[PDB]
Design a protein around this ligand. Sequence first.
Ligand SMILES: O=C(O)CNC(=O)[C@H](CS)NC(=O)OCc1ccccc1
Ligand SMILES: [Zn+2]
Ligand SMILES: [Zn+2]
Length: 266
Amino acid sequence: EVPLPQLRAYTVDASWLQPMAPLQIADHTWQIGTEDLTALLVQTPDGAVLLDGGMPQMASHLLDNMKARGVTPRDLRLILLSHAHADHAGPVAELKRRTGAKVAANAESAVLLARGGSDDLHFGDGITYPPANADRIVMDGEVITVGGIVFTAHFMAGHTPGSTAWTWTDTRNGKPVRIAYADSLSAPGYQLQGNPRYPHLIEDYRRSFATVRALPCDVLLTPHPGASNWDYAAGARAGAKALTCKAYADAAEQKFDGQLAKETAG
Ligand SMILES: O=C(O)CNC(=O)[C@H](CS)NC(=O)OCc1ccccc1
Ligand SMILES: [Zn+2]
Ligand SMILES: [Zn+2]
């Protein structure tokens, strides 16, 4: 008698779950997540925006960091997402219950979020999380403005169908800083070629490399900070080694081409 296996939790490196204090990126923009997962707070005179929340168990830590910044539950107006995997959208449902936040996302991200990341094109039910509903559906190139910070959506399908880069302009020394929060360009364990659930996967990734390369991009940030060479634990030099969007796109394409060759060989 051999029973069916137990459910397996989505377990991650400790650094992904290690709380950090708010780290200022620009005059209105702060990293408020963990050492190894990005969660960006943008604070304005007319309320706050959160871009990603990390893993499901980060909800209370995000709220504590918000409070440290002076942002109350009612002040949080909007949640935006890079993509709706458990390690970036994990706490969205809980945050919606505990704050005034509404979610804006593209149709692909909204559908995946509403499924709690189940029936993932590549991971199946391996990384599920509490489902949430989007309040507003955004189209490619659509802008959303909160307290004069203008967020533009740039669709960059591949890592997920609904993967998005969000760009906005903040300041640092009275000078503009064009921030690009670019989504993952990885395909971890994906079948790339002839995948029946994603027939045009390769062409979407190629288009997404080009989109990322061309973003307005004084400062690049990524959901996994290591992807853009950020080190959130390095304090005053956290962003010193950060890649350009151009360099991030180039490295991702080189890796992707390598993975294609390995897939053909395998
Ligand atoms: O850093 C990256 O690019 C990818 N890292 C991840 O953790 C991704 C989400 S972005 N998830 C994953 O690989 O999940 C694999 C998996 C885990 C449990 C069960 C099935 C599949
Ligand atoms: Zn992902
Ligand atoms: Zn991830």
